[PDB]
Each structure stands twice: as structure tokens, then as C-alpha cells.
């Protein structure tokens, strides 16, 4: 069988969104925690 192309395109939009979110989930100001 295989993918219907709708699933391919929808899956690619979730690839772009998931990779941008997971790249955002790094904290890096190179000053991550700080005492008040």
C-alpha cells in the first residue's frame, strides 16, 4: 500500500512545527538560571 499524499503533506507540516518547537525547548541565554 503506502501513504496517501494528504498524509505526506500533513506529516511534513508537523515535521516543521515539531522541529521548531523542540529546537525552541532548549534554554540557552548562556545565563539560564539566576538567583533573584
Amino acid at each position: 500500500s503506502g501513504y496517501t499524499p494528504d498524509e505526506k503533506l500533513r506529516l511534513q507540516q508537523l515535521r516543521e512545527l515539531r522541529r521548531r518547537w523542540l529546537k525552541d525547548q532548549e534554554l540557552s541565554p548562556r545565563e539560564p538560571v539566576l538567583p533573584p
Binding site: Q25, E26, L27, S28, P32
Partner: protein, 68 residues
């Protein structure tokens, strides 16, 4: 790059209640412990003398510990 943001739900209310609990127990935990220690190290408990002849004690002077 090796470190990531970890997620933990809202430790501030935890720490605030814990700090207030320990402080407002220990505000009169330590002064009362100092009080009871200074009593039973600087006033005496009692001795076990018998009742003297022709004398009556009251309803205190029957008890060991002086705060009691």
C-alpha cells in the same frame, strides 16, 4: 546544547508554605524549649521528703516537675 529546559510544576507555593510552616512553628518552639531547659537546669525538680509533724501541704507540693 547538551542541556535542555526541564519542566516541573510550580514549586513556589510548595516552598512558601513549607517556609511559613517551619517559621511559624519555630517562632515559639525555640523560646519554649529554652524556657523549659532553663527551668529544669536552674530551678530544681524536688526532693522526696516525708510530711513533717504537725504540718499540712497544699494541693501543689505533691508534684515532681516545677512547671507541673
Amino acid at each position: 546544547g547538551k542541556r535542555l529546559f526541564i519542566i516541573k510544576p510550580s514549586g513556589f507555593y510548595d516552598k512558601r508554605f513549607l517556609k511559613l510552616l517551619r517559621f511559624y512553628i519555630l517562632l515559639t518552639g525555640i523560646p519554649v524549649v529554652i524556657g523549659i531547659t532553663l527551668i529544669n537546669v536552674f530551678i530544681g525538680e524536688a526532693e522526696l521528703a516525708e510530711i513533717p509533724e504537725g504540718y499540712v501541704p497544699e494541693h501543689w507540693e505533691y508534684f515532681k516537675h516545677p512547671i507541673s
